[PDB]
Design a protein around this ligand. Structure first.
Ligand SMILES: *[C@@H]1O[C@H](CO)[C@@H](O)[C@H](O)[C@H]1NC(C)=O
Lengths: 97, 49, 49
């Protein structure tokens, strides 16, 4: 699960537990417009390499990276957003993925 | 006839590093020097140096 | 040793200067070939290109 920064719940974000930093193949931060409206993302694997594309504004989609893993991923999921300002009594706002 | 097709020896290699730097010099040049009794340790992983 | 991800950078990619004018082998950005380099001033490139 994952919690929200602003108007957080009475819980804490805890989805993984590690006593040491594991070995990773890619780690880099990205920035986008805070005043955007709709975001688009593309993901696909082929010939053993995986791709990622992101877009914050406009019709096309920009490039992120091209990773080599040698395996074939099969599953994908979207963690829920536990918060308190996504209710009817709060401001009118819902979550769509 | 075929002329002289000798191939050069130089080679140019440019590629995205894909990983951030370790910044070991930034940690070794800190303004605060730890005492020999504390000897604060540092761990570096998933980075290039 | 010889494992993990924290590899070195001065092994073979010493970031040589662009020796424009002569024919040289290109092995950069995952593309092999040969050619001559020239110097221009372009502005159509983007951050992800
Ligand atoms: C990415 O942002 C997080 C949160 O601010 C930070 O802890 C991390 O060091 C950043 N990573 C890079 C590569 O800037």
């Amino acid at each position: 699960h994952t919690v929200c920064k602003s108007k957080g719940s009475i819980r804490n974000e805890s989805w993984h537990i590690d006593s040491s930093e594991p070995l990773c193949l890619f780690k880099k931060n990205f920035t986008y417009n805070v005043s955007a409206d709709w975001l688009y993302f593309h993901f696909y694997q082929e010939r053993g390499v995986f791709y990622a594309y992101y877009a914050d504004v406009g019709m096309p989609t920009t490039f992120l990276f091209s990773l080599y893993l040698g395996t074939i991923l099969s599953h994908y999921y979207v963690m829920p957003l536990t918060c308190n300002a996504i209710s009817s009594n709060t401001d009118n706002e819902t979550l769509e993925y | 006839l075929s002329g002289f097709t000798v191939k050069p020896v130089a080679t140019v290699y440019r590629r995205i590093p894909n990983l951030p730097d370790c910044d070991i010099d930034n940690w070794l040049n800190n303004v605060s020097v730890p005492s020999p009794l504390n000897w604060e340790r540092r761990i570096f992983s998933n980075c290039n140096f | 040793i010889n494992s993990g991800t924290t590899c070195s950078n001065d092994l073979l990619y010493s970031n040589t200067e662009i020796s424009t004018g002569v024919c040289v082998n290109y092995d950069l950005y995952g593309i092999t070939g040969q050619g001559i380099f020239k110097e221009v001033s372009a502005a159509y490139y983007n951050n992800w290109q």
